[PDB]
Amino acid sequence: TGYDRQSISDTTAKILLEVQAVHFNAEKPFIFTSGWASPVYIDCRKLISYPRVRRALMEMAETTITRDIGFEQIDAVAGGETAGIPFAAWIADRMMVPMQYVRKKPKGFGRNAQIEGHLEEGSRVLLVEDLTTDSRSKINFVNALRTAGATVNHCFVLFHYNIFKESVSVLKDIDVDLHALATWWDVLRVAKASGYFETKTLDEVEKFLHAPAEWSAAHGG
Amino acid sequence: TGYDRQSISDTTAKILLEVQAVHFNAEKPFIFTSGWASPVYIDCRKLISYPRVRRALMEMAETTITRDIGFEQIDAVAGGETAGIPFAAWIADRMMVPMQYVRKKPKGFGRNAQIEGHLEEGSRVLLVEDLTTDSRSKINFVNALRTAGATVNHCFVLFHYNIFKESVSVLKDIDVDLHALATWWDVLRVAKASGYFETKTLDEVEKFLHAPAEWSAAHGGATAP
Ligand code: NA
């Protein structure tokens, strides 16, 4: 699958396109429950349904983690509910460490109402999610972990939008480093080189990537 | 971890006690938001946090599935959101098949509204959950899968209470067979044999397993979970 960051980015973008976890539509943009308009759409949940694909992604996740964080810095892996859970389960297995998962909302009240699994005080926990857009929803999960006694300095996702400043800075501002396999820039570059898409389509995707909030406003949102 | 149903039931029960996924308390029972009162409590979600335990559980799950269902009867494994998901992820991996998961509630429209992942029309799907009490919440998940075009004839859980009279038939009535590693009866058997518990505690657990609603009503609770 590749050891270096660049081959992992490439292979991951190719996979996202190969099984159409990524879709483009310049003519009829994707409209989101939040009222965002976009010519791009990704569903990383799709990836769980392809045995060879998910294996490769999990192999590359473990490589990314051990390369950029280390081999013995993580005592447990916690998945964000829901879409982070399958990936957390596989990464936890590969890393031979305890798994937890973190509920979006507490069940009851207490320093532990969002944590499922056993979490030892002092454990260094890696937060795993499928993707990040602007990382705002990660603050909840990081907080639940820290309140429950965990040390959290890293978050891993498969896919990092990398089009909003916030995706890195919201995490850095609460002392968490972001790690990922690929971004929209990797998808765009592979898509271009492939020859499979119309220039009109990729032109629009690129426009969105450079200024997505403005692009949304000019096409709907 | 063993190949026959008896040794898998004993090993699973021992695991549940070893990491205290199971707890007993007869004098100060567990009181649920329904007001149900029980001297027993189980949290299967704790099992995901023990690397050797979860490996044994998943090996035993794969054995149970291939022994009692077959080797080529399943095209995909779908976990019930949320506690089913980790176990479905590991079982899908072991079986070398696509995974999906099933939402409690549909999101948006279309045949696949209640499914996440990719589900090929015609796929024979195994529903996976951590546990079942009376199996009533399972009907939703089987429906969701059938609506999306799956064939579903089997549901697998780690733990089947086996104290409420419909927990098998409510599924059999909709042409689904329940498969499980262990029950409360297995937990009681191993707990008694271990010598680790007070006699009074196990006597009360036993009374509860035999007549749960009655026990609940006599010890502070309501008549239904
Ligand atoms: Na869906």
User: What technique determined this structure?
Assistant: X-ray
Closest to B148 in 3D by CA, of B53, B205, B76: B76
Whether A116 sits inside 8 A of B45 (CB atoms) is yes
Whether B85 sits inside 8 A of A82 (CB atoms) is yes
- To which H or E segment does residue B59 belong? helix B51-68
- To which H or E segment does residue B42 belong? strand B40-42
**Could you tell me how far CA B17 lies from the centroid of its own chain?**
16
A interface with B, Cβ–Cβ < 8 A, is 19, 45-46, 48-51, 54, 76, 79, 81-83, 85-86, 88-90, 92-93, 96-101, 103, 116-119
For CA atoms A114, B33, B87, B51, give the dihedral sign. Answer: positive
Residue type (1 letter), B147: T
Cβ contacts (< 8 Å) between A96 and chain B: which residues? 51
Let me know: does A144 contact A114? Beta carbons within 8 Å. Answer: yes
For ligand 1, the distance from its centroid to the CA atom of residue B112, given in whole angstroms, is: 4
Residues of A at the annotated binding site? 103-104, 107, 129-137
CATH of the domain at A186: 3.40.50.2020
Let me know: does A30 contact A37? Beta carbons within 8 Å. Answer: yes
Whether B86 sits inside 8 A of A81 (CB atoms) is no
Closest to A74 in 3D by CA, of A151, A14, A139, A9: A151
Give the residue numbers spanning the domain of A51.
1-221
User: Which three-class secondary structure state does DSSP give residue B127?
Assistant: strand
**Distances B221 to B33, B38, B39, B203 between C-alpha atoms, Å:** 10, 8, 11, 19
User: Which three-class secondary structure state does DSSP give residue B184?
Assistant: helix
Per residue, the 3-state secondary structure of chain A, as one string, reads CCCCHHHHHHHHHHHHHHCCCEEECCCCCEECCCCCEECEEECHHHHHHCHHHHHHHHHHHHHHHHHHCCCCCCCEEEEECCCCHHHHHHHHHHCCCCEEEECCCCCCCCCCCCEECCCCCCCEEEEEEEEECCCCCHHHHHHHHHHCCCEEEEEEEEEECCCCCHHHHHHHCCCCEEEEEEEHHHHHHHHHHHCCCCHHHHHHHHHHHHCHHHHHHCCCC
Strand order in the sheet with A76-80: A115-116, A99-102, A76-80, A124-132, A151-160, A177-183
Task: Report DSSP state, residue B49.
Answer: G
Contacts of residue A169, Cβ cutoff 8 Å, sequence gap at least 6: none
Rounded to an integer, what distance in angstroms lies between the CA atom of residue B117 and that of residue B189? 40
Q: Provide the domain count of chain B.
A: 1
To what resolution in angstroms was this structure determined? 1.9
In the block, tokens 């973008």 appear at A13
Closest to B81 in 3D by CA, of A33, A42, A81: A81
Whether A48 sits inside 8 A of B101 (CB atoms) is yes
**Phi, psi for A219 (deg, rounded to 5):** -135, 15
Whether A49 sits inside 8 A of B98 (CB atoms) is yes
User: Which three-class secondary structure state does DSSP give residue B164?
Assistant: coil
Closest to B148 in 3D by CA, of B166, B125, B171, B121: B121
Rounded to an integer, what distance in angstroms lies between the CA atom of residue A110 and that of residue A107? 9
Q: Closest to A45 (Cβ–Cβ): which among B19, B51, B117?
A: B117
Rounded to an integer, what distance in angstroms lies between the CA atom of residue B94 and that of residue B84? 16
